[PDB]
Enzyme design. Structure first.
Site, short mmCIF file in Angstrom:
data_model
loop_
_atom_site.label_atom_id
_atom_site.label_comp_id
_atom_site.label_asym_id
_atom_site.label_seq_id
_atom_site.Cartn_x
_atom_site.Cartn_y
_atom_site.Cartn_z
N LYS A 112 -62.07 13.41 98.37
CA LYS A 112 -62.54 12.40 99.31
C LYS A 112 -63.06 11.18 98.57
O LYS A 112 -62.71 10.04 98.90
CB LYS A 112 -63.62 12.98 100.23
N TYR A 163 -68.40 21.92 99.27
CA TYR A 163 -67.29 21.00 99.48
C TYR A 163 -66.48 20.83 98.19
O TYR A 163 -65.31 20.49 98.23
CB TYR A 163 -67.80 19.65 99.99
N1 NDP Z 1 -63.23 18.73 110.28
C1 NDP Z 1 -64.27 18.10 109.74
O1 NDP Z 1 -65.44 18.47 109.91
C2 NDP Z 1 -64.04 16.90 108.88
C3 NDP Z 1 -62.77 16.50 108.66
N2 NDP Z 1 -62.48 15.40 107.85
C4 NDP Z 1 -61.08 14.95 107.63
O2 NDP Z 1 -60.39 14.72 108.84
C5 NDP Z 1 -58.97 14.87 108.61
C6 NDP Z 1 -58.38 15.82 109.62
O3 NDP Z 1 -59.05 17.10 109.58
P1 NDP Z 1 -59.16 17.90 110.98
O4 NDP Z 1 -58.59 17.14 112.12
O5 NDP Z 1 -60.64 18.28 110.88
O6 NDP Z 1 -58.31 19.29 111.18
P2 NDP Z 1 -56.70 19.47 111.22
O7 NDP Z 1 -56.54 20.54 110.21
O8 NDP Z 1 -56.26 19.67 112.67
O9 NDP Z 1 -55.82 18.22 110.77
C7 NDP Z 1 -55.42 18.12 109.39
C8 NDP Z 1 -53.93 17.89 109.40
O10 NDP Z 1 -53.42 17.70 108.06
C9 NDP Z 1 -52.14 18.25 108.04
N3 NDP Z 1 -51.61 18.30 106.68
C10 NDP Z 1 -52.10 18.98 105.60
N4 NDP Z 1 -51.40 18.82 104.50
C11 NDP Z 1 -50.38 17.96 104.89
C12 NDP Z 1 -49.30 17.39 104.19
N5 NDP Z 1 -49.08 17.56 102.89
N6 NDP Z 1 -48.46 16.59 104.88
C13 NDP Z 1 -48.69 16.37 106.18
N7 NDP Z 1 -49.69 16.85 106.94
C14 NDP Z 1 -50.50 17.64 106.23
C15 NDP Z 1 -52.30 19.55 108.82
O11 NDP Z 1 -51.00 19.99 109.26
P3 NDP Z 1 -50.58 21.50 109.42
O12 NDP Z 1 -51.68 22.48 109.76
O13 NDP Z 1 -49.48 21.30 110.50
O14 NDP Z 1 -49.95 21.72 108.05
C16 NDP Z 1 -53.12 19.03 110.00
O15 NDP Z 1 -52.24 18.51 110.99
C17 NDP Z 1 -58.83 15.27 107.15
O16 NDP Z 1 -58.61 14.10 106.37
C18 NDP Z 1 -60.19 15.90 106.84
O17 NDP Z 1 -60.55 15.84 105.47
C19 NDP Z 1 -63.54 14.72 107.20
C20 NDP Z 1 -64.80 15.08 107.39
C21 NDP Z 1 -65.21 16.19 108.29
C1 AEW Z 2 -69.33 22.72 102.93
C2 AEW Z 2 -69.56 21.60 103.94
C3 AEW Z 2 -68.58 21.60 105.10
C4 AEW Z 2 -68.37 20.25 105.74
C5 AEW Z 2 -67.39 20.29 106.89
C6 AEW Z 2 -66.62 19.00 107.06
C7 AEW Z 2 -65.14 19.16 106.80
C8 AEW Z 2 -64.42 20.14 107.55
C9 AEW Z 2 -63.09 20.22 107.35
N1 AEW Z 2 -62.43 19.40 106.48
C10 AEW Z 2 -60.97 19.53 106.35
C11 AEW Z 2 -60.57 20.48 105.25
C12 AEW Z 2 -61.55 21.01 104.41
C13 AEW Z 2 -61.20 21.86 103.38
C14 AEW Z 2 -59.88 22.23 103.17
C15 AEW Z 2 -58.87 21.74 104.00
N2 AEW Z 2 -57.56 22.13 103.79
C16 AEW Z 2 -59.22 20.83 105.07
C17 AEW Z 2 -58.15 20.24 105.94
C18 AEW Z 2 -63.09 18.43 105.73
O1 AEW Z 2 -62.45 17.70 104.99
C19 AEW Z 2 -64.50 18.35 105.93
#
Ligand code: NDP
Ligand code: AEW
Ligand code: NDP
Ligand code: NDP
Ligand code: NDP
Ligand code: AEW
Ligand code: AEW
Ligand code: AEW
Lengths: 254, 254, 254, 254
Positions: free
Chosen positions: A162, A155
């Site tokens: 984060k 990560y």
């Molecule tokens: N997925 C996981 O396992 C985990 C996710 N999270 C968090 O959840 C949140 C959403 O992730 P997730 O839903 O998983 O996947 P997504 O990638 O679908 O959603 C992330 C969004 O962020 C947008 N984005 C990135 N940079 C910008 C910017 N500068 N301005 C505006 N929009 C931006 C992307 O837009 P686009 O592609 O249109 O640029 C996308 O719509 C994040 O904060 C991530 O860290 C936390 C823990 C675990």
């Molecule tokens: C190495 C451990 C993986 C844990 C997965 C949880 C996770 C999965 C996805 N994301 C979003 C993410 C992670 C890394 C880079 C980017 N751009 C984005 C949107 C997270 O912030 C966190």
């Protein structure tokens, strides 16, 4: 019940977006929803998505959080188009896949500061602007991951972002408490999202969760959405500066 | 919506009881509620209270948590009278006012172990029994205080009991995760309860809260009840082993 | 340098005792050491041990921490035999192997309260008495494990005891801060001790440590002793109520 | 004993610098010390300072941590001038006094990212380079403040930077554990430093510490230095990714 409530949802990229899992839930509670996207090309796919919701009109605004203006203006516009809102969901973050693969010590300065910018600061300025649309107060929720609290294999830089974000929340919560605005975060478990694609050892973790997490299973965007609702609603009145782990209680074990 | 849901509420002593603030909220959501008390003399005052609720019949059982039987039997009986339940709220605790005034180092062994017994263990055995009434799973919530996480002036022995309790929750959450039972706790802010009466300087803290807490105000039994509901409901599915601070975010500052 | 310093070491059972790893280190720094044991039968094996140390005379006292007197008297006696001391090391704890194997929810009340008594309270009373031998102040250190902070598979009731202990430390640290006595704890990594023998999945963990811990290795009684020294010495002046993880940084990962 | 040990101390500005309190202690243990400064004008005042130490030769290098090169080169040079080192002390941080006065929500993007850069990232790159001078391993220590863990009145953006830093430590600790490098942090109490000058609510806190902190007193640069030594020495072997509060145990209360 969320009629007469209007929330802004930032960070939907697709049907697998976590922010989408949230939207569904809120929509299902009769909340009026507003959305933000980064690039135009997304917008169409977006409108395509909305259609699955009982949203009278689609209110979509384009905001890239790196631009002070796009945010300031974007919100003001919403203020003009929909008036006041009840809260904001923040599902935005970014990091360079390189900096996540390389050793953490090798992390580049741009890569580092970039993640800080998009993944953490964004929240601050968003709050500042959204505040203007919540005169009687409201609730703000951001999405974090366990890696903000512990060193999680790979990560790397995102972890520190984060961590930064989780602090951002507290300082905001404190700053805006008086203005009756609650600021909290959801530490989500690993979910199969667009961005989740391409991460090393992701699948491994998902499994380790099932095997070790108290609930012996994984979580989904909806479950997050549900907690999100709790937080955005008056249900969670009295809760601010809190980080709620929706992760099958994986956070609690070791 | 909590129709078809049945919850056991332990630890109501009066209209100011936190557990009562909970009951009101649950009742208001159509949940079927069951109650437990320690002494007979309370029971009357108790029935007197229920009348403020839309509970068809009053299901009151007498359980002093120090008795292994009173608990084992008490629950079995409920199992017979109402069948299966969806969860339990645990609002019980005790400590000798002496041990809270004296220097902590002076704390007596009985006083100490007593608080551990009533304030922490009770949960364990209660869970074990309630488990038997939740075949398809359910949710258990306990009430803790910030003093379980930090040395709080005067909370002394009770502090350690809460600490113990907060760990109890985690270990339970892990043990019963597989049986699809979620175990969480609410770290409540200071509230004017029966037991809150007689504590040194209490009033000081209530004020410091208003002055320092992000929300610059205090919390009530209802607000707790609300969060309690979130936790007891399927809304908080995916949340287990968590401790939620309903305290105007006082936990987040320093 | 620890000449003119006198420390009481409680909880040596053998050459593998963690408290022994400490003793060696302190002895090696010229500290005058005093020891306590539970049963007579141990005492001989004990004296046998001391011989590996440059301790002029052997000061051994028998204290079972369940007896208020054995402690009160035991210390007073030391006060008479060696006068004032500079600090105490507390390497004592107990739990029934049953309660560690069974599901946590099944834990018995005796088993529970027993662990609380020996593993946590003991500290409180010990401190109260030792205080009397530290007029100009001093340092107290207790030994905890990560399972006090997270639900660790199988640690069960002992976990809660440690949790309780870790809070005990803070409350003591606060209580005795004014009397210039520092109270801290060491969260040790898993070590092959007498008591470590017989625990399920122990070997598993030791390996997981090597594989996951930042240092990719395990820790020993000496390393603990070293940190112990830091804590007991004036080096750690200004540190009180702290819990230091001597565990290859395993605490920091997830 | 620190003969044959060589440490790099970054972030001395004057006799009140915390990093100076450290240096004194290390020097007093026979360690060979290397120093870094930001601006030339400091350098003279600096050499003036060194004279109070038993350092055979003065090894001073100019590194502003915002420049990737100044760091890469700076270290390489040290590698050439003094060969290998045993560890690094990092006493560097910055934030705009404006962003600390204004409401946190008003924090500017530059101001924010700037603090992240200097106060957190710096560590990452420094580590990466210092690594090259520690083939058999070594210890790295950074200086944080309690405001990294809680919203502290006015600490605002610096708080978030520290939070970020404290995570940085963990991720580094993990990354470099294998290369036998320990990375830890010291959460220092408030101390009267150059930078401490000009902060609102500073004097207030110092007093609140004395009044509330367990030790009922404040801490100094030396005490920090002492703990710093513990951490930089083989004494703290087995400790990595840890954050040690040298703050009269203020961290433990509430
Ligand atoms: N997925 C996981 O396992 C985990 C996710 N999270 C968090 O959840 C949140 C959403 O992730 P997730 O839903 O998983 O996947 P997504 O990638 O679908 O959603 C992330 C969004 O962020 C947008 N984005 C990135 N940079 C910008 C910017 N500068 N301005 C505006 N929009 C931006 C992307 O837009 P686009 O592609 O249109 O640029 C996308 O719509 C994040 O904060 C991530 O860290 C936390 C823990 C675990
Ligand atoms: C190495 C451990 C993986 C844990 C997965 C949880 C996770 C999965 C996805 N994301 C979003 C993410 C992670 C890394 C880079 C980017 N751009 C984005 C949107 C997270 O912030 C966190
Ligand atoms: N009030 C506050 O500010 C805070 C309260 N809390 C916690 O919230 C919960 C509610 O406390 P509170 O509402 O303050 O005051 P209450 O007195 O309403 O609730 C405590 C209840 O515990 C019952 N009880 C005590 N011992 C036993 C026992 N052995 N068996 C069964 N019941 C028992 C009492 O019944 P009876 O009198 O009939 O024996 C009483 O009804 C507790 O866990 C408390 O520690 C946490 C943080 C702050
Ligand atoms: N081993 C490990 O991996 C870890 C251990 N710890 C902690 O370290 C400490 C030492 O355990 P360890 O040294 O590993 O193994 P040991 O079993 O060698 O030491 C435990 C000691 O406790 C003593 N003891 C037990 N009950 C009493 C009592 N009533 N009164 C006085 N002494 C008593 C025993 O004395 P006797 O046999 O003479 O009664 C024995 O000397 C414990 O607190 C443990 O919780 C923490 C983390 C990990
Ligand atoms: N003072 C306190 O109460 C506390 C301080 N801390 C931390 O301790 C550390 C030292 O602060 P402190 O000793 O208090 O006071 P000082 O201000 O005396 O020391 C700060 C030092 O950082 C140097 N520095 C700043 N920016 C840079 C840069 N870009 N490149 C290189 N060096 C730089 C300054 O150099 P110059 O002026 O020569 O440019 C100065 O020597 C900081 O990290 C601070 O956050 C933590 C907790 C409490
Ligand atoms: C030193 C500050 C006092 C704590 C205020 C909040 C509070 C108020 C009440 N209670 C419950 C309590 C406290 C003390 C003794 C008993 N019996 C009971 C049930 C708590 O656990 C905590
Ligand atoms: C289930 C994880 C096992 C972790 C082993 C670390 C450990 C090893 C020993 N001890 C002491 C102990 C453990 C179990 C029972 C008893 N009686 C005693 C004294 C501890 O408290 C902790
Ligand atoms: C309201 C809380 C005040 C806490 C003072 C402790 C403190 C004192 C000084 N510093 C360094 C600092 C503080 C503010 C701005 C800058 N640039 C720097 C280097 C800290 O990071 C922390």
């Amino acid at each position: 019940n969320l009629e007469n409530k209007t929330y802004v949802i930032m960070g939907i990229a697709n049907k697998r977006s976590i922010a989408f899992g949230v939207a569904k839930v809120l929509d299902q509670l009769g909340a009026k929803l507003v959305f933000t996207y980064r690039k135009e090309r997304s917008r169409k796919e977006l409108e395509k998505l909305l259609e699955q919701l009982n949203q009278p009109e689609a209110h979509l605004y384009q905001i890239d959080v790196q631009s002070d203006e796009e945010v300031i203006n974007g919100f003001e516009q919403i203020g003009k188009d929909v008036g006041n809102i009840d809260g904001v969901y923040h599902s935005i973050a970014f990091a360079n896949m390189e900096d996540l693969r390389g050793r953490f010590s090798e992390t580049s300065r741009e890569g580092f500061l970039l993640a800080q910018d998009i993944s953490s600061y964004s929240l601050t300025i968003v709050a500042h602007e959204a505040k203007k649309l919540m005169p009687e107060g409201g609730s703000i929720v951001a999405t974090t991951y366990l890696g903000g609290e512990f060193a999680v294999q790979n990560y790397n830089v995102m972890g520190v972002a984060k961590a930064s974000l989780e602090a951002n929340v507290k300082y905001l919560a404190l700053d805006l408490g008086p203005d009756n605005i609650r600021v909290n975060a959801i530490s989500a478990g690993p979910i199969r999202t667009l961005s989740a694609k391409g991460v090393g050892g992701f699948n491994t973790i998902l499994k380790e969760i099932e095997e070790r997490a108290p609930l012996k299973r994984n979580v989904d965007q909806v479950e997050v959405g549900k907690t999100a609702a709790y937080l955005l609603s008056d249900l969670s009145s009295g809760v601010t500066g809190e980080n709620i782990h929706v992760d099958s209680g994986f956070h609690a074990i070791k």
